[PDB]
Amino acid sequence: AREWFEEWFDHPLYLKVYHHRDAEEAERCVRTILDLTGIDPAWQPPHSVLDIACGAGRHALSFARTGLRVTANDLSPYLLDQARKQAKAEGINMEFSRQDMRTIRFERRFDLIAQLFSSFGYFETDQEDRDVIANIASLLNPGGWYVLDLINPVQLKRHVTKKITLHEANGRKHSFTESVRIYSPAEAFSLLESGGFAVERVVGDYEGSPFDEATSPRMMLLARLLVSR
């Protein structure tokens, strides 16, 4: 199975999103993040990246391929075990975490924290999203980066339902349906700017195209931790 789909349902409207393995969306996203943030994978000791929602494990593995120290976090044990197998099969070293973003804790800190492919805003209230932002800020090294990949709301025409369904080889079904708090660009900026971050760029796609509110498919914000005396 190379193809997977996301489905967005509002009350009257509907949007389908197509994802193919051969598109290499994960690598192109990682390449854009590395280029725009200036993170050098060749640097020693290697910088540390936390993929706070690895999903199947495609983009976290893409980070790890460049030589970065990658920790992958997801609530689904199946999706984590999928990422172990792929990393094991490619001889790639990765750490794995199964923590909720509202209470996620680590002993170490990170240089980059990546929340990619519309994995933000699943919670009951808006306050829980501000808590997660504050949590991510406390896990970053000084000058650390936070990359937030949100859908651009124009592409859906405050809560929409996002539905994903996966099938194992034998046919076993895995259902991933969520509520998604939909943030305008202003709201996404206000969320990060008042969370301790400074937004450095916004891009409209995984190739780095400029974000246009009225036309872009993606709203990927790349933010950097403000300085503290």
Residue numbers in the entry: 13 to 169, 194 to 265
Which lines from the publication concern this structure?
The LMW thiol N-methyl-BSH (N-Me-BSH) has been identified in the green sulfur bacterium Chlorobaculum tepidum, revealing the presence of a putative S-adenosyl-l-methionine (SAM)-dependent methyltransferase (MT), NmbA, which could catalyze the final biosynthetic step of N-Me-BSH. In the presence of BSH and SAM, our results show that CtNmbA and PpNmbA catalyze the methylation of BSH. Our findings suggest that NmbA acts as a selective N-directed MTase of the cysteine moiety of BSH, catalyzing the last step of N-Me-BSH biosynthesis. NmbA exhibits substrate selectivity for BSH over its oxidized disulfide form, BSSB, indicating that the methylated form of BSH is likely involved in LMW thiol-dependent biochemical processes.
